[PDB]
Design a protein around this ligand. Structure first.
Ligand SMILES: [Ca+2]
Ligand SMILES: [Ca+2]
Ligand SMILES: [Ca+2]
Ligand SMILES: [Zn+2]
Length: 303
């Protein structure tokens, strides 16, 4: 038999303390013991009907309904009643913002004679709460006032009429704040401090990941697609992709020079001791509109 469902409201912050009791289910008789029907990540049920925080409540990790929804078995006349409990959980601003810029680290060029207020980069941050209010800031300026960032748009502009120097690195350290989420009476939730690299004139291409990793089983099909690798050109020149092995396994793999897709060019057999269980490869992105080239590591482990 079924008891009236218990429906109740809380902020995720009301569940900010492990083992804190948040409410108790009614007893029908005093002998009654309570057992949760299924282990729950968020709550424990005590034998007397008390409900406690298990893992700290987190609105961001709950599913679409944003509830902790569970059944409880109530044993004792000799009866075994069932009762459902639904805890509606309310969002509080409690998660820090993060940068969504890619690739990382943040990189850019600046033309040698950029007029003042030339837009050079756009900081882009998100924040997990429903209630965010993001502000962008330079925190370390190692450039002598050559750049500023718009507090709201994230746009990074040049200041001053002075020339910029070819192949010189202008470095800024930036961050975003969610000014709807305090840590104290002073400070707000923050991204990490990111280093923004601005080079005068031009610079080599950059990969979308600082290094690449793939794990495949030993029965992987020949010629099948393993992983996709992409580099960006700062002057939108054409990129040609190229691959090579550090030690063991030349020819085991190859890359489409335009797609940047890596395929398995040979059969894998763990019985064949000549074949390593870990491949160290180097992918190279060459600007084949003359000159600039960049490399990255590709590690492929086999199981
Ligand atoms: Ca949270
Ligand atoms: Ca939240
Ligand atoms: Ca936040
Ligand atoms: Zn939003």
């Amino acid at each position: 038999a079924v008891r009236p469902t218990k429906r109740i409201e809380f902020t995720e912050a009301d569940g900010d303390t492990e083992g804190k009791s948040v409410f108790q289910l009614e007893k029908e008789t005093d002998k009654e013991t309570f057992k949760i029907r299924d282990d729950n990540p968020w709550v424990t049920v005590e034998t007397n009907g008390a409900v406690r925080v298990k893992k700290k409540w987190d609105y961001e990790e709950l599913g679409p309904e944003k509830t902790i929804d569970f059944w409880v078995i109530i044993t004792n006349i000799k009866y075994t009643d069932n009762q459902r409990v639904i805890i509606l959980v309310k969002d509080v601003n409690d998660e820090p913002p993060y940068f969504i810029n890619r690739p990382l680290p943040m990189q850019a060029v600046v033309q040698l004679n950029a007029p003042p207020n030339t837009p050079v980069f756009t900081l882009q941050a998100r924040d997990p709460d429903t209630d965010h209010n993001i502000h962008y800031f330079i925190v370390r300026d190692r450039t002598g006032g050559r750049f500023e960032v718009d507090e709201r748009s994230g746009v990074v502009r040049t200041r001053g009429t002075d020339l910029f120097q070819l192949d010189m690195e202008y470095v800024l350290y930036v961050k975003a704040e969610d000014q709807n989420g305090k840590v104290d009476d002073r400070r707000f939730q923050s991204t990490p401090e990111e280093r923004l690299s601005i080079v005068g004139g031009k610079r080599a291409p950059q990969f979308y990941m600082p290094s690449y990793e793939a794990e495949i089983p030993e029965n992987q099909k020949k010629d099948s697609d393993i992983i996709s690798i992409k580099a960006k050109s700062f002057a939108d020149r054409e990129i040609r992709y190229t691959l090579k092995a550090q030690g063991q396994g030349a020819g085991t793999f190859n890359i489409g020079p335009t797609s940047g897709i890596v395929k398995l060019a040979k059969e894998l057999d763990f019985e064949d001791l000549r074949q390593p269980h870990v491949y160290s490869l180097i992918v190279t992105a060459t600007e084949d509109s003359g000159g600039f080239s960049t490399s990255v590591d590709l590690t492929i482990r086999v199981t």
